[PDB]
């Protein structure tokens, strides 16, 4: 039983990694009501340098473990020097809601605050990412107040929304294989219905291909789609988002790959364009 505690922080996890640290920590989470763990990776910083800050938001069934086991994302952060925070997809414990299916309750939180019952009590996702975490992670570690954010699936829609929604907020997005319409795809109609109702309305500010057309616009964004995706026709409808953004005039650079899937084998192929991408923004 070897703890170490800094402050609200109890360090769960520590490894080095291409000459950097890749860190677990557990925390009290006041916007979730529940204990949360989020990984941080720390390039080698001797003197304590500030240096920006990238989200990673992952998508469903997923904890803070899958991206920072199997994206090899570390090499790529310590070459650019950027600290890099996964935090973990939903809020977690016996205590918390849950459901049997994979695209519902735990590992499933869709980066909104719900206001349904029972899951208004902890599921807050939104806000935790937005206000909470951050004010954390600026607190323990040297960063230098700038921050980019992007994710996978659920966690590239969460990525999405949150810039969009939050303009200065974030220095850049981008995003893998992404749930871009979640109101008109099974994934969002489902998790949307029964966190914040049967009123569609609602959903719109939690949607990036809703906002857009809103009005909502960000500088730029990545967005890589592998065309071997089996989500790709049913739950993420990358040109149906094209068209979107076309009409609205919102910029957008997206890739799509021949013969890669919705899994960390296509990740880890293209996380390092994402880390460099999102480096240039955080100097």
């Not at 871009?180 to 939690?206: H, I, M, N």
Request: with cysteine.
């Amino acid at each position: 039983e070897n703890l170490y505690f800094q402050g609200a922080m109890e360090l769960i996890e520590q490894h080095q990694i291409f000459g950097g640290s890749q860190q677990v920590w557990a925390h009290h989470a006041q916007t979730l009501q529940c204990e949360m763990k989020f990984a941080v990776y720390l390039p080698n910083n001797p003197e304590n340098r500030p240096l920006g800050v990238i989200y990673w938001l992952s998508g469903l069934t997923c904890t803070e473990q899958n991206f920072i086991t199997k994206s090899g994302f570390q090499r790529y952060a310590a070459e650019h020097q950027v600290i890099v925070v996964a935090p973990d997809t939903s809020p977690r414990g016996e205590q918390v809601p849950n459901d049997d299916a994979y695209d519902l309750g735990q590992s499933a939180g869709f980066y909104l605050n719900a206001t349904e019952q029972p899951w208004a009590a902890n599921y807050q996702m939104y806000d935790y990412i937005l206000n909470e975490l951050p004010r954390l992670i600026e607190k323990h570690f040297p960063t230098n107040g700038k921050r980019s954010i992007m994710g996978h699936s659920m966690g590239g829609h969460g990525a999405l929304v949150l810039a969009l929604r939050n303009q200065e907020r974030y220095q850049s997005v981008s995003a893998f294989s992404p749930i871009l319409s979640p109101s008109l795809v099974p994934w969002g109609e489902k998790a949307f219905t029964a966190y914040l109702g049967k009123d569609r309305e609602k959903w719109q500010q939690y949607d990036a291909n809703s906002l857009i057309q809103q009005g909502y616009k960000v500088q730029g964004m990545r967005i890589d789609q592998g065309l071997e995706d089996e989500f790709l026709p049913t739950q993420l409808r990358t040109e149906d988002f094209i068209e979107t953004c076309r009409a609205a005039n919102q910029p957008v650079d997206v890739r799509f790959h021949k013969g890669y899937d919705h899994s960390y084998y296509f990740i880890a192929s293209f996380i390092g364009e994402h880390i460099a991408y999102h480096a240039a923004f955080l100097k």
